[PDB]
Amino acid sequence: MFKRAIIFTSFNGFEKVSRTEKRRLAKIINARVSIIDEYLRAKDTNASLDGQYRAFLFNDESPAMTEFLAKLKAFAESCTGISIDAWEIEESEYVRLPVERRDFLAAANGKEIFKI
Amino acid sequence: MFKRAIIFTSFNGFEKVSRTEKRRLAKIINARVSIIDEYLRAKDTNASLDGQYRAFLFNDESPAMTEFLAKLKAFAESCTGISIDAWEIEESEYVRLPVERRDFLAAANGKEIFKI
């Protein structure tokens, strides 16, 4: 029940992504990133947000994950210029993936949560 | 072989910039500011760092320009509150630019390196 939430955020090209929308999405991400995985931190920039995988560790028995994902889902529904894809994968299953290219391979081997 | 690295540092407004972050960026900049070039020297203040161009002379036969650009990029990536744009221009082209707004014009006429 330890699972990685793999989110792929991208700019879909059908609308300009505004400063407020980049800020909001980087804020949502950074409310879950702690001092121990600073490497998942986001900036409100194209380079940080457009075309990037982030894999967050979640224990699904807790309502954290489900709350995190609903913020994401509702935000992506509010923002036509940003697509968000999300997959859950068992952590036990994830730790044994190749170190290089890992997040894409987890997303192809994972359960589709949503796809906005 | 002689080039200028043009850098534009700014506080992007996503996050507060701490004093230690200001000092760390000033220290990275000042590693390439000798005692002769006091005009380039970075202070740990908004006036000195927030919204300022600086143009560093380099000889591209040395790896010094690349290691400094690497240290800058790494800093900007880990500090959510600071943006750094970097361009490169030929020294012969840099000295035939008008003196006023030269670094601005050099950035305009320059080859883009990163925007983090």
Burial of A94: CB neighbours in 10 Å, binned 0-12, 13-18, 19+:
buried
Asked if A43's CB is within 8 angstroms of B80's CB, the reply is yes
Task: Decide if B116 touches A, using CB distance below 8 A.
Answer: yes
For residue A80 the two structure tokens come to 């036509």
CB atoms within 10 A of CB B112: 11
Sequence length of chain B is 116
- Tell me the structure's resolution in angstroms, rounded to a single decimal: 2.3
Instruction: Tell me which H or E stretch contains B100.
Output: none
Tokens describing residue B4: 């200028």
How many other C-beta atoms are found inside a 10 Å radius of the C-beta of residue B80? Answer: 22
Angle at A98 between CA A109 and CA A25, to 5 degrees: 65
CA–CA min distance A48, chain B (Å): 8
Residue A108, class by beta-carbon neighbours within 10 Å (0-12 exposed, 13-18 middle, 19+ buried)?
Answer: exposed
Half-sphere exposure of B69 (CA within 13 A, CB side): 23
* Structure-solving method: X-ray
Longest dimension (CA), chain B: 39
Separation between Cα atoms, residue A75 and residue A84, nearest integer Å:
9
Q: Say if the Cβ atoms of B14 and A44 lie within 8 Å.
A: yes
* Shortest CA gap A10–chain B (Å): 17
Chain B CB within 8 Å of residue A44 CB: yes
Residue that is written with structure tokens 């200028």 in the block: B4
Cα angle B17, A53, A42 (rounded to 5 degrees) comes to: 10
| B14 contact residues in A (CB cutoff 8 A) | 23, 26, 43-44
Give residues with Cβ within 8 angstroms of B113, minimum separation 6. B5, B69, B86, B87, B88
CA dist., res. A111 & res. A69, Å (int): 14
Estimate the crossing angle of helix A63-78 against helix A19-32, to 10 degrees: 170
CA proximity to A17, closest of A80, A84, A72, A73: A80
Q: Give the Cα separation of B42 and B52 in Å (integer).
A: 10
Q: Report CB contact under 8 Å: B115, A43.
A: no
Which residues, numbered 1 to 40 in chain B, qualify as contacts with chain A under a Cβ-Cβ cut-off of 8 Å?
A: 12, 14
Distance between CA atoms of residues B104 and B81, nearest Å: 22
Q: Which two tokens mark B30? A: 């000042």
Question: If you count residue pairs, one on A and one on B, with CB atoms under 8 Å apart, how many are there?
Answer: 19
Reference B69, options B82, B51, B87; nearest CA is B87
Q: Do A26 and B12 touch (CB under 8 A)?
A: no
- In A10-55, which ranges are continuous DSSP H helix? 19-32, 46-49
- Which residue shows structure tokens 């030269």? B102
